[PDB]
Design a protein around this nucleic acid. Structure first.
Lengths: 94, 716, 735, 249
RNA sequence: AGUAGAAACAAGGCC
RNA sequence: GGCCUGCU
């Protein structure tokens, strides 16, 4: 019943910014190539706190993740999730 | 089943049983057999009590109908059929009057012959069990118990049956009527056992209707119902949410501490403008005294005669003329008022006995001087709306005025000694304890120090003037009244003396609110020429009324002698607070005694005598161009007394605000001087808070100048 | 040489002579006219400190309400009412964790009290806003009027005599289509649902007088009678909670406050080692009441009452629900003057919604323009925050939660803090190994305070090293120092009556000697001055003097008649035997052995027509509003003499349309006196029950006539006469 | 006789009849406190303002039939104009002093028995013995102490039933006091005050004061005894201690 | 005019 | 001119 599509990923510079968007409580999770899932934010983890901000528009039915001051260690597929329902993920490469 | 109690029983009993039903708060629709059972109990109580009378003998007189007479005494008087409070009232009253024992449960009747209670109960079950049941319910009971049961049997302890047997035949006929009438009804499927002693209830406080919707509109922004918010609260647990918002909150939200150093505090800025004027209700530094040297005490005597006698002691009267005009009023009115006062004083002098209080004529002169018929007439808004000039009352910050040097000199001479004792204290219980002797000696020392002080004279002047003004306002509300300013002192030689500063004319004083203003006009003799400090007398009109000759080595001066005349006003609150000026003595001398006690806690001995005689120790109590000047403890006493007196005289909201906001800065400066690393979050805000209290009051501006001087001398 | 008292501080420390800085010997500032301007200013200020919230319109009252909760976090140090629900819930959770069992217990005792409380407890209160007349009236009068209106409308559950039932009726009244009220000018007027809702949710605004310590006047509020029961229950819960918190100082007296302050400072400094520095902040909170949102109090109470009976939660939640929708009456109005035509006018505040703005100055014009959108039926919606410290105890609870949130277990850093909070004032002792640690600790404390809608007044606050600070006019300098300038206004005649004034004055001198370190000689001087003022106020001079007054003749003849003149009371023109050793003895008992038996009997005669006693509460209790504090009551020792008269009443009701209230007063008092003669314990213990007057009175007449015959004066003739007279009044009550 | 007679007279008039009928016992207190008189905010100001009027105090109507309307010179003692919301009449303060020089006299021998606390204070102080004053810093520490020196080890409610049974024996209701200390107190204060006619309310109030224990927090240095706390103002100071021994010891 | 200071008094109402 | 009120 809950389909999810992520937008806003891509190739960025280190120290740059990026606004992920995903069209119930909700979460942003990430998966690096060599690992399983990592908690990012819900509506933040130690590795992303202060850099990253999660925010939702319940009228637009969308959850956003505003990433700033990015590091090469953010490089992952960022998946959106609803709580059982998981997006396909959007690639972010820093 | 309730149809039976609809049909048979009389109204009286059914509503008695209904109120007994309401008594313990259970509802009649759920279980009614209790209603029927207890109403039958109540019916047997009546039918057993009524129709039974007594006369002066025992041997109750039984009459089917009470005949008209004083002989209507009832054999058995009922307990039940009443509320619990009254049932226990009757129980206690019977016990206290009959000298009997108090039962712990409710009886049903009282009887005289045997002087005791009856607890009637007719139960469905047979008697010979219910009897001893209720008997073991009641502890060690002398009240006789008697019960019937439907089969028709009777029983009792002592084999005692207290009245006629035809009455009991009546009871059991009633009983079987009940029985074989339910026979037609058919209730025994539950009649024998229908009550088991149920007592339980749940308190219900339900939010519903409009009040529920209000609850749905008093939640955080993203909640829809009180149910959901309460569920969220119950499910809420701490998961480090304060830390997240603290990290996300902007860092400009801080409480950075600004160090407070010697170079940090700046002098308080004083307002600039026209010089400050005089606000007191009487002359303080420029007063003159006409005396008689009478032996009367402060309150002893009659005012008008004393004033006239004092004024006759002076010779050299001249026709009064204007010297310094009011600059805003009609000085000829003041001149005519002075001459009118003199004329009416003579008029009193002529007649038989000086009146205790005199009323003056309401001439146009004092009508203007006292502000009569000047309040705008009160009307309705619907009748005055097109008037362009119609607007609010003038509500703005007071006029700004700069400090002048006259208040400083006035305070300087308010702390100086005098040639008289201006305090005659009352009596106290003879001292019995050594501590009381120490207290009395200390008090005598302070009285010797402060009695010869201009501050005490001002205290007495204000107290007397305000007392007389308040009493006249409360008594002679309508008519203008004359009151001579009188103060009685004692000379160094010991001879008592009276002093007449001048006169006060009180006007209409229909004072309703504590802020309503009573206007009066004050006239006071003086020798100080007003041509040297005119800005201090902005609101005064000063005439020339005579010449005075005081013995001096330079021939004899033959100085002029002027009359300061002005229109002033007060209020009930101001009069009341000015008539309690004697607590300035308290304030000051409590401070000095605290100093003495604090110093004496160091050296294990009372230190008052050496403080007051040796005068070795001194405190900074003023600054001279050479530097800071220190004075003995007595001078500190007088200085603090003068400060308190001026606080009571020039009281105003400015004084309170400045006092608070400057005590804050004084504490900060003291912390700095104590090496306690003081710090401030916004010192500019505190400075702006202090500086907004300084507008036009001479006293607060002088206090601010003193504070600036203290800062300059401190911080070193 | 120029005299300057302030220079005295160069030798005497500031706190050792702080009494000199308290000008409490002059008249305190008073307000003169309307308080409407202050009310409008307060409403606008409360609404603009929360401007960034969200607006809504209540569907019941139709008034605009502003909700700032969970709003944007502040980005400046200005006052802000944007409290965060999660943060405050977490603070309350930590408060519970540090004090396990606090909420459950406090709720248990509160539940006991609520389910055993009576209606009459609401009469024990000062002025309350009666909505039946739209004006402030004594609590008992307003309660009686509301009960009468409810009974006339059909809400008679309050007849159960329970406050909970009265509140049930109050809530049920909210769902009525049309209520009826009475007005005299009697006219019966009908109030629809919305009008009655607004009349029950409104507050009456007045100007506070006799307020020392500030240049500007303020406004205060008084609620109605429908909401006072819920407030009573909520404050009972909050008091029970705070009594279990040592960091709170609101439910205690002054000496307890000083003791707790000393204990906390010693604990903080002593435990601190040589390496840790300690600093005390003497903090005041700016706009304390205007920034406390009732919704947050609702959240706190619903967290407190978790796992409790739902009815208890509902009854405790009703109060903040009504405060969140509270309305405020603008005030008396505005008075205009026209000098050209020489007249004055008084427009009521209710016209501010429609009256043109040509009559108002720029400041008032702008205030009215800003407050008009919130005007609904002559009253302004004040949802964003509290008006004047109605929830003092809950605010203290929030402050104590903030204080406890830095117990070094939640700080997670070397620095830590503690202190004492009493609403609008606090002392904060913060310790940290270095000045940087102290700065970080104070910064985090301030930031956390801003997350709870609490602001710290930077202008009225300062930080120094521990050992010197201030708290509610109590100056601590290595130990509290007496002031004696706060109690100076209480050294005069109280104004109750002669005996009461004498006893109160001597007792005040005694107490200020015990507590405020008043000196012996100073106390003797105070006694002398008080006796002088007392004699000059009551026209009771020594008698041997020639001071002619309205009372000097009778006093002088009594003086010449008495043989042992040393036993005469000062009220009757006798000598004063009081001294430092006799300050704890009533005057009558101190002079008992010296009085002549004739004068003694005439003085203390029960049949005197002057002594009047109403209830056990008002026997020897005097309400003296202390300077710089809330109204307080004192027990004064006095003997019931002929001097214990009660003074004249106002008597201005005779010129008002509300003149029938005096006839009702007289009739009620006649009935009450009759009942008391029938029920002597009516005064000491208030009677309880559900019966009516005449039933109890007639039935007790029956029984008392009976028994007083069985031994006493009555006779058969009289007993039968009483019995048939009881029957006569019975049949009269029938018809 | 009389009581039921004014009852019938009240019920004669319709308004008072309605008040008596519809008003329940529980509401007794409310209507008794029902008044238009506001509680004074500034009592001192008006006491200093009212005493300057003629007829500033209030007294029962009976004063009109015990005290003459005027004294020897014609100064009026009482007026027939009733108070605002009461049947009492406004009278002058002289009517007080007059009552103390020619008013009816009684036997005040039992007032010492009633006002037990105050007379016990006087007796304790009269036989006290003072001592030298020692000047040294006093470390005043704040402690909770009992001020009432005659408390019989009873609380407010605990002694309230005792007080009712002593004064109002019939309105006690269910309660019959179990503790034997209360029994002896009731017996003593019953036989002692058997015919005292001061007032039931004042007797009850003073019994409550005497028997009920009361406690307050005060700055003390030494002492700590009930008898030594009533004179705490005289024995302890800022820098001086006055040795004292009340008459009881 | 005067008192006083963010609004008032300098009598009110009723005939 | 006569009378009423002074916290309503």
């Amino acid at each position: 019943q809950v389909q999810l599509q992520e937008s806003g990923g891509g190739l960025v510079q280190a120290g740059e910014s990026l606004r992920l968007s995903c069209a119930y409580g909700m979460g942003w999770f990430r998966q690096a190539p060599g690992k399983e899932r990592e908690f990012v934010a819900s509506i933040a983890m130690d590795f992303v706190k202060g850099r990253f901000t999660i925010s939702r528009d319940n009228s637009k039915n969308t959850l956003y993740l505003q990433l700033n001051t990015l590091k090469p260690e953010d490089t992952a597929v960022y998946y959106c999730a609803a709580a059982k329902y998981w997006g396909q993920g959007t690639q972010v490469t820093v | 089943m309730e149809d039976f109690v609809r049909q048979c029983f009389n109204p009286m009993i059914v509503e008695l049983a209904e109120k007994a039903m309401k008594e313990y708060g259970e509802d009649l629709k759920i279980e009614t057999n209790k209603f029927a059972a207890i109403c039958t109990h109540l019916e047997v109580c009546f039918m057993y009590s009524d129709f039974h009378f007594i006369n002066e003998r025992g041997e109750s007189i039984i009459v089917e109908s009470g005949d008209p007479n004083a002989l209507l005494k009832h054999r058995f008087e009922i307990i039940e059929g009443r509320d619990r409070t009254m049932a226990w009232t009757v129980v206690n009253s019977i016990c206290n009057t009959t000298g009997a024992e108090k039962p712990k449960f409710l009886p049903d009747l009282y009887d005289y012959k045997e002087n005791r209670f009856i607890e009637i109960g007719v139960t469905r079950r047979e008697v010979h069990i219910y009897y001893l049941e209720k008997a073991n319910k009641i502890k060690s009971e002398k009240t006789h118990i008697h019960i019937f049961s439907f089969t028709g049997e009777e029983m009792a302890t002592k084999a005692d049956y207290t009245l006629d047997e035809e009455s009991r035949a009546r009871i059991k006929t009633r009983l079987f009527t009940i029985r074989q009438e339910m026979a037609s009804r058919g209730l025994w499927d539950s009649f024998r056992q229908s009550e088991r002693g149920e007592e339980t209830i749940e308190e219900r406080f339900e939010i519903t209707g409009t009040m529920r919707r209000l609850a749905d509109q008093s939640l955080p922004p993203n909640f829809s119902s009180l149910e959901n918010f309460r569920a969220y609260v119950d499910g809420f647990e701490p998961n480090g949410y304060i830390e997240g918002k603290l990290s996300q909150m902007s860092k400009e939200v801080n409480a950075r501490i600004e160090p407070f150093l010697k170079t940090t505090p700046r002098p308080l800025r004083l307002p600039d403008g026209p010089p400050c004027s005089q606000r007191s209700k009487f002359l303080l530094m420029d007063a003159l005294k006409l005396s008689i040297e009478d032996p009367s005490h402060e309150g002893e005597g009659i005012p008008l005669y004393d004033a006239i006698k004092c004024m006759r002691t002076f010779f050299g009267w001249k026709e009064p003329n204007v010297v310094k005009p009011h600059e805003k009023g009609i000085n000829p009115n003041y001149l005519l008022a002075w001459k009118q006062v003199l004329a009416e004083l003579q008029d009193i002098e002529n007649e038989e006995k000086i009146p205790k209080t005199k009323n003056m004529k309401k001439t146009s002169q004092l009508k203007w001087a006292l502000g009569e018929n000047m309040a705008p007439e009160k009307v309705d808004f619907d009748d005055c709306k097109d008037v362009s000039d119609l607007k609010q009352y003038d509500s703005d910050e007071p006029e700004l005025r700069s400090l002048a040097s006259w208040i400083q000199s006035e305070f300087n001479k308010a702390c100086e000694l005098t040639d008289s004792s201006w305090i005659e204290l009352d009596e106290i219980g003879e001292d019995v304890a050594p501590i009381e002797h120490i207290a009395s000696m200390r008090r005598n020392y302070f009285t010797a120090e402060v009695s010869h002080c201009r501050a005490t004279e001002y205290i007495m002047k204000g107290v007397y003037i305000n007392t007389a003004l308040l009493n006249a306002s409360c008594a002679a509300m309508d008519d203008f009244q004359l009151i001579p300013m009188i103060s009685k002192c004692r000379t160094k030689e010991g001879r008592r003396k009276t002093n007449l500063y001048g006169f006060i004319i009180k006007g209409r004083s229909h004072l309703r609110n504590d802020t309503d203003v009573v206007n009066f006009v004050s006239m006071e003799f003086s020798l100080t020429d007003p041509r040297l400090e005119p800005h201090k007398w902005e609101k005064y009109c000063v005439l020339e009324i005579g010449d005075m000759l005081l013995r001096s080595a330079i021939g004899q001066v033959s100085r002029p002698m002027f009359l300061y005349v002005r229109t002033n006003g007060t209020s009930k609150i101001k009069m009341k607070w000015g008539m309690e000026m004697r607590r300035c003595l308290l304030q000051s001398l409590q401070q000095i005694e605290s100093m003495i006690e604090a110093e004496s806690s160091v050296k294990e001995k009372d230190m008052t005598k050496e403080f007051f005689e040796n005068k070795s120790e001194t405190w900074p109590i003023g600054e001279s161009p050479k530097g800071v000047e220190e004075g003995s403890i007595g001078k500190v006493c007088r200085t603090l007394l003068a400060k308190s007196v001026f606080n009571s005289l020039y009281a105003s909201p400015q004084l309170e605000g400045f006092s608070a906001e400057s005590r804050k800065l004084l504490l900060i400066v003291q912390a700095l001087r104590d090496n306690l690393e003081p710090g401030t979050f916004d010192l500019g805000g505190l400075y702006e808070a202090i500086e907004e209290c300084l507008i036009n009051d001479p006293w607060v501006l002088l206090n601010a100048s003193w504070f600036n001087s203290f800062l300059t001398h401190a911080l070193r | 040489m120029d005299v300057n008292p302030t220079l005295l501080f160069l030798k005497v420390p500031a706190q050792n002579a702080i009494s000199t800085t308290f000008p409490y010997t002059g008249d305190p500032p008073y307000s003169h006219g309307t308080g409407t301007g202050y009310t409008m200013d307060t409403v606008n200020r409360t609404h603009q400190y929360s401007e960034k919230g969200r607006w809504t319109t209540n569907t019941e009252t139709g008034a605009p309400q502003l909700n700032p909760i969970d709003g944007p976090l502040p980005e400046d140090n200005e006052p802000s009412g944007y409290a965060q629900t999660d943060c405050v819930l977490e603070a309350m959770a930590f408060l519970e964790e540090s004090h396990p069992g606090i909420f459950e217990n406090s709720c248990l005792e509160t539940m006991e009290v609520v389910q055993q409380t009576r209606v009459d407890k609401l009469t024990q209160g000062r002025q309350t806003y009666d909505w039946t007349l739209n004006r402030n009236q004594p609590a008992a009068t307003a309660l009686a009027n509301t009960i009468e209106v409810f009974r006339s409308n059909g809400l008679t559950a309050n007849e159960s005599g329970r406050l909970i039932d009265f509140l049930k009726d109050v809530m049920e009244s909210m769902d009525k289509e049309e209520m009826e009220i009475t007005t005299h000018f009697k006219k019966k007027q009908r109030l629809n649902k919305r009008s009655y809702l607004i009349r029950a949710l409104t507050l009456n605004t007045m100007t506070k007088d006799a307020e020392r310590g500030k240049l500007k006047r303020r406004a205060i509020a008084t609620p109605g009678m429908q909401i006072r029961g819920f407030v009573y229950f909520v404050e009972t819960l909050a008091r029970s909670i705070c009594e279990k918190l040592e960091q709170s100082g609101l439910p205690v007296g002054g000496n307890e406050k000083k003791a707790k302050l000393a204990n906390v400072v010693r604990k903080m400094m002593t435990n601190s080692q040589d390496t840790e520095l300690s600093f005390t902040i003497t903090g005041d909170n700016t706009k304390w009441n205007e920034n406390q949102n009732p919704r947050m109090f609702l959240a706190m109470i619903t967290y407190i009452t978790r796992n409790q009976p739902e009815w208890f939660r509902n009854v405790l939640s009703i109060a903040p629900i009504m405060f969140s929708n509270k309305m405020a009456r603008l005030g008396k109005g505005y008075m205009f003057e026209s000098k050209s035509m020489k007249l004055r006018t008084q427009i009521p505040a209710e016209m501010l919604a429609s009256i043109d703005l040509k009559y108002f100055n720029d400041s008032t014009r702008k205030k009215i323009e800003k407050i008009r959108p919130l005007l609904i039926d002559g009253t302004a919606s004040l949802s964003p925050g509290m008006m004047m410290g109605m929830f003092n105890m809950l605010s203290t609870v929030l402050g104590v939660s903030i204080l406890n949130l830095g117990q070094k277990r939640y700080t997670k850093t070397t620095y830590w803090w503690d202190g004492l909070q009493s609403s609008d004032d606090f002392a904060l002792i913060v310790n940290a190994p270095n000045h940087e640690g102290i700065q970080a600790g104070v910064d985090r404390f301030y930031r956390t305070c801003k997350l709870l809608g609490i602001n710290m007044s930077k202008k009225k606050s300062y930080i120094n090293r521990t050992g010197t600070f201030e708290f509610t006019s109590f100056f601590y300098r290595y130990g509290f120092v007496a002031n004696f300038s706060m109690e100076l206004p209480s050294f005069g005649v109280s104004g109750i009556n002669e005996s009461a004034d004498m006893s109160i004055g001597v007792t005040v001198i005694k107490n200020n000697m015990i507590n405020n370190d008043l000196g012996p000689a100073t106390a003797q001087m105070a006694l002398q001055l008080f006796i002088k003022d007392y004699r000059y106020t009551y026209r009771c001079h020594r008698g041997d003097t020639q001071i002619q007054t309205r009372r000097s003749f009778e006093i002088k003849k009594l003086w010449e008649q008495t043989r042992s003149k040393a036993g005469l009371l000062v009220s009757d023109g006798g000598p004063n035997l009081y001294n430092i050793r006799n300050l704890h003895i009533p005057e009558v008992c101190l002079k008992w052995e010296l009085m002549d038996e004739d004068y003694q009997g005439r003085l203390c005669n029960p049949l005197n027509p002057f002594v009047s006693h109403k209830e056990i509460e008002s026997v020897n209790n005097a309400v003296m509003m202390p300077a710089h504090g809330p109204a307080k009551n004192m027990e004064y020792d006095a003997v019931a003499t002929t001097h214990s008269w009660i003074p004249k009443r106002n008597r201005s009701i005779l010129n008002t349309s509300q003149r029938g209230i005096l006839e009702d007063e007289q009739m009620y008092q006649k009935c009450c006196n009759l009942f008391e003669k029938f029920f002597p314990s009516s005064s000491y213990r208030r009677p309880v029950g559900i019966s009516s007057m005449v039933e109890a009175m007639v039935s007790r007449a029956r029984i008392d006539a009976r028994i007083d015959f069985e031994s006493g004066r009555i006779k058969k003739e009289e007993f039968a006469e009483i019995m048939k007279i009881c029957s006569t009044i019975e049949e009269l009550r029938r018809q | 006789m009389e009581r039921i007679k004014e009852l019938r007279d009240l019920m004669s008039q319709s308004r008072t009849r309605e008040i008596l009928t519809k008003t329940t016992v529980d509401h007794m207190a409310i209507i008794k406190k029902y008044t238009s008189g506001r509680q004074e905010k500034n009592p001192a100001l008006r006491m200093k303002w009212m005493m300057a009027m003629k007829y500033p105090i209030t007294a029962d109507k009976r004063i009109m039939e015990m005290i003459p309307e005027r004294n020897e010179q014609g100064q009026t003692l009482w007026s027939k104009t009733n108070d605002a919301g009461s049947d009492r009449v406004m009278v002058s303060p002289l009517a007080v002093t007059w009552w103390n020089r020619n008013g009816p006299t009684t036997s005040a021998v039992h007032y010492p028995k009633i006002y037990k606390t105050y007379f016990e204070k006087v007796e304790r102080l009269k036989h006290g013995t003072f001592g030298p004053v020692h000047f040294r810093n006093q470390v005043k520490i704040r402690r909770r102490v009992d001020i009432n020196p005659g408390h019989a080890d009873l609380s407010a409610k605990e002694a309230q039933d005792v007080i009712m049974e002593v004064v109002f024996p019939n309105e006690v209701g269910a309660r019959i006091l179990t503790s034997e200390s209360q029994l002896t107190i009731t017996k003593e204060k019953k036989e002692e005050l058997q015919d005292c006619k001061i007032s039931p309310l004042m007797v009850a109030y003073m019994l409550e004061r005497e028997l009920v224990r009361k406690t307050r927090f005060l700055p003390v240095a030494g002492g700590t005894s009930s008898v030594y706390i009533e004179v705490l103002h005289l024995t302890q100071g800022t820098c001086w201690e006055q040795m004292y021994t009340p008459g009881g010891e």
